Amino acid sequence: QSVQVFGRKKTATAVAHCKRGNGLIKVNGRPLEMIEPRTLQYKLLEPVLLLGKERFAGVDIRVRVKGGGHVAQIYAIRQSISKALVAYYQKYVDEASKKEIKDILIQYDRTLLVADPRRCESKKFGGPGARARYQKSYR
């Protein structure tokens, strides 16, 4: 009667809890509007401004999140909201509604279901970072 999925960017892991509820989506115990980078409030609200409030009216989402930064935790929250609603519709609704959710979520942006797998390369001696090298001189 409950779902637990994880969303993921560079280091962040937002883990969404979906049980049968009314529609209070909470990040770490606070609303989606009050989440502090409000420049990306629409980035947070994409999976509910896409599929409407009525497809979320039966669930209740308490998202916890830790790791990464601010932008990387926004892209982890919205991935776990999508991956939680899809798993709820697969586990307690039919496959057809899961398909009709998944095609709109994929059609907007595939990074609402598939993790972004790129991480930071390692620094090497000889330069300041992974690819860049120290300045050299002549004679």
Partner: protein, 144 residues
């Protein structure tokens, strides 16, 4: 209509709590308020001459979100970036008496007490008025 501190943006909640603490009167404001910098990295004294009320508000709110903190954790909360000369910048801590004369100022309104684990946390009587003013700030933004 169950309002808690987390159901409102904190940047106005701190202003509301500072206005409530200022209007109470019985907050033990120290003697060196109009002379000090709040850390060793800030190059000027703060602009608002009532800075002690805003600081004593936000220390209490960080005791709402996680208690068990003391003057050492409050030094790490209110720490910033020290721009130092032609050497690169580094994170410097805050003060340990500006962050200590707020903590036993909140004891002056019996809003906090020293917990058994060592730091300081909120009393239930001090958890009353924080939620009261959270309701008072969540009830004055949607109607106007």
């Amino acid at each position: 209509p169950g309002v808690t501190v987390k159901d409102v943006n904190q940047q106005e909640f701190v202003r509301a709590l500072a206005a409530f603490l200022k209007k109470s009167g019985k907050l033990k404001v120290p003697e060196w308020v109009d002379t000090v910098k709040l850390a060793k990295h800030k190059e000027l004294a703060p602009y608002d001459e009532n800075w002690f009320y805003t600081r004593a508000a936000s220390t209490a709110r960080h005791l709402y979100l996680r208690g068990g903190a003391g003057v050492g954790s409050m030094t790490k909360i209110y720490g910033g970036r020290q721009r130092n000369g032609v050497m690169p910048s580094h994170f410097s801590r805050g003060s340990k008496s500006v962050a200590r004369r707020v903590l036993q100022a909140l004891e002056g309104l019996k809003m906090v007490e020293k917990d058994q684990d060592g730091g300081r946390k909120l009393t239930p009587q001090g958890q009353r008025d924080l939620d009261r003013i959270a309701g008072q700030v969540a009830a004055a933004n949607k109607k106007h």
